[PDB]
C-alpha cells in the first residue's frame, strides 16, 4: 500500500555505491600508462627502499604500506 518507498531507498543506496567507485577511480587513476622503476637504484644517494614496492612479498605493498595495513561479526 505504502507505494514506492522501497524503490526510492534502493535508488539512493545504489547511487551512493556508484559514487564511491567513481571516487576511488578519480583519486588514483591520474596516470594512463603504468610505469616500472628500473632495477638500478642510483638515485644520487637517496635510499628509496621503504616506499618502492617490495618484491619478496605476496602483494606489491611496500614496507610503509604494509605497516599502515596492519595498523587498521559480519555473518549476523
Amino acid at each position: 500500500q505504502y507505494g514506492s518507498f522501497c524503490t526510492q531507498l534502493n535508488r539512493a543506496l545504489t547511487g551512493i555505491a556508484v559514487e564511491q567507485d567513481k571516487n576511488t577511480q578519480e583519486v588514483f587513476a591520474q596516470v594512463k600508462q603504468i610505469y616500472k622503476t628500473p632495477p638500478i637504484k642510483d638515485f644520487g644517494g637517496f635510499n628509496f627502499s621503504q616506499i618502492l614496492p617490495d618484491p619478496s612479498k605476496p602483494s606489491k605493498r611496500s614496507f610503509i604500506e604494509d605497516l599502515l595495513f596492519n595498523k587498521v561479526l559480519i555473518c549476523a
Binding site: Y2, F5, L9, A12, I16, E26, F28, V72
Partner: protein
C-alpha cells in the same frame, strides 16, 4: 569505519522494539492471531521499521557528501603536490615544498 559500523548496529538493534505492538517477532503474531485483526498489529511494525530505515538512508547521504569533499581535496593534492611543485603556502606540507 567505526562511525559507519556504529549505524548498522543501531539499525539491526531496531528489530528488537515492539513500537507498541504485542510482540516484535513477525512469526509470532502471524501464528497467534487471526487474519482480520492481525493487520492492526502488523501495521504498527511497518510504520516503525520504515522510519528506522529512512533515518539510516538519510544519514548516509549526508555522510557520503562529507567524503565526496575529501575525495576531491585528495584528487587535487594528488595533482599539484605530486605531479608538480606547489607554491600554495601550507597546501602541500608545512614550509617550502619540494615533492
Amino acid at each position: 569505519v567505526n562511525q559507519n559500523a556504529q549505524a548498522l548496529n543501531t539499525l539491526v538493534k531496531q528489530l528488537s522494539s515492539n513500537f507498541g505492538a504485542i510482540s516484535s517477532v513477525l512469526n509470532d503474531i502471524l501464528a497467534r492471531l487471526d487474519k482480520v485483526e492481525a493487520e492492526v498489529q502488523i501495521d504498527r511494525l511497518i510504520t516503525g521499521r520504515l522510519q528506522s530505515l529512512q533515518t539510516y538512508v538519510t544519514q548516509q547521504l549526508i555522510r557520503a557528501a562529507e567524503i565526496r569533499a575529501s575525495a576531491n581535496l585528495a584528487a587535487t593534492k594528488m595533482s599539484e603536490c605530486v605531479l608538480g611543485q606547489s607554491k600554495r603556502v601550507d597546501f602541500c606540507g608545512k614550509g617550502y615544498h619540494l615533492m
